């Protein structure tokens, strides 16, 4: 019944450019058990994104990637919501271009 | 090809 909190990395595919198309990535790793709710948020609202198939690391901990295309914008705000059994409340990691 | 058989616990 041993559990591990998720690790979340919110990042773009390429170096972010304002006005120029990119891909947004929410990479969630090292979590157990495998139940999880991962969503990408634009201005707090949910995004149409795709999810990779469930897989795990050498230490059995799971990793999962949710991804969608997006255009970086001075006026827009991107986030990733992660709900999991080990977190008392959904984790929200905002996107930083500089990374 | 995935293994056709697994032995139950």
């Amino acid at each position: 019944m041993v559990q591990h909190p998720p690790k979340i990395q919110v990042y773009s595919r390429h170096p972010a450019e304002n006005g120029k198309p990119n891909f947004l990535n929410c990479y969630v790793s090292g979590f157990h058990p495998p139940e999880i709710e991962i969503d990408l948020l634009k201005n707090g609202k949910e995004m149409k994104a795709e999810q990779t198939d469930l897989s795990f690391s050498k230490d059995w901990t799971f990793y999962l990637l949710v991804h969608t295309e997006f255009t970086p914008n001075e006026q827009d705000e991107f986030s990733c919501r992660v709900k999991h059994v080990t977190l008392s409340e959904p984790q929200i990691v905002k996107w930083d271009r500089d990374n | 090809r995935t293994i056709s058989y697994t032995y139950p616990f």
Binding site: R13, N25, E35 | P8
Partner: protein, 275 residues
């Protein structure tokens, strides 16, 4: 050098939420080629790599068929474990299996794997000799005795030495144009101030394959791995990977630090600096 075939099974019991969920994913090296999800409405093993669409229907109903009967066997195993560990139906439980093979330039078997986990901890693993079992606890020790009596290791060693390596070769030829292709990293360095007297320099490695890479920082020809933050190697989203390594340096001294990127995709390990 080496090339790997591995399958990853995940069984999760969903109490009162129906029958348990079964997921199967297959990897060749660092590339995912197949997938199965019991929840998904297709009821089929599906290609997750373009070079797989080469295979016909005969390949996939076979691959579905095995994965379906495996889902059933794993459905029973979930109850069995629940019996061993004296657990109730209320709680959701996870059993994992990962198995597969490594091969050397020979094409012959280099190494073989077959391990299991329960609720995120080692249950049973096949040893490197491929004839003996390592059982974590005494509940796993039960399975071990049954498995020894049933001669499971011989059956596994046989799949691993034979069937595993044939298909690994076969998949390697199907995806030769990308699986044997090497992607060198895209390397830049970035600066971000922390204080009036400290800055963060960051060594980027973008869009490389496979995932194995080494990002070292040094100052004057001598690495300082004590003062280095370094992320997990993450997916770029297009199949390739990305990693970075940072170091807190004095805002007065930038050129004195050099990053060193090592990757099989590169002919020569390349070095970067702030400009």
């Amino acid at each position: 050098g080496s090339h790997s075939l591995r399958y990853f099974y995940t069984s999760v019991s969903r109490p009162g939420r129906g029958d348990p969920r079964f997921i199967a994913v297959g990897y060749v090296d660092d590339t995912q080629f197949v997938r199965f999800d019991s929840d998904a409405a297709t009821g089929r093993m599906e290609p997750r790599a373009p070079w797989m669409e080469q295979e016909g229907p005969e390949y996939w109903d076979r691959e579905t068929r095995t994965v379906k009967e495996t889902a059933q066997r794993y459905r029973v195993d979930l109850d069995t474990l629940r019996g061993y560990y004296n657990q109730s139906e209320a709680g959701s439980h996870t059993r994992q299996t990962m198995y597969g093979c490594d091969l050397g330039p020979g094409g012959r078997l280099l190494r073989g794997y077959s391990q299991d986990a329960y609720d995120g901890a080692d249950y049973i693993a096949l040893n490197e000799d491929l004839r003996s079992w390592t059982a974590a606890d005494t509940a796993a020790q039960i399975t071990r005795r049954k498995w020894e009596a049933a001669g499971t290791a011989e059956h596994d060693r046989n799949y691993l030495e034979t069937t595993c390596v044939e298909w690994l070769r076969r998949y390697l030829e199907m995806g030769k144009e990308t699986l044997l292709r090497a992607e060198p990293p895209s390397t830049r360095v970035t600066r971000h101030p922390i204080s009036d007297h400290e800055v963060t320099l960051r060594c980027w490695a973008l869009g490389f394959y496979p995932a194995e890479i080494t990002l070292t920082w040094q100052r004057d020809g001598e690495d300082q791995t004590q003062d280095t933050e370094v992320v997990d190697t993450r997916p770029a989203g297009d199949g390739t990977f990305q990693k970075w390594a940072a170091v807190v340096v004095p805002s007065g001294q930038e050129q004195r630090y050099t990053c060193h990127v090592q990757h099989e995709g590169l002919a020569e390990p390349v070095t970067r600096r702030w400009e």
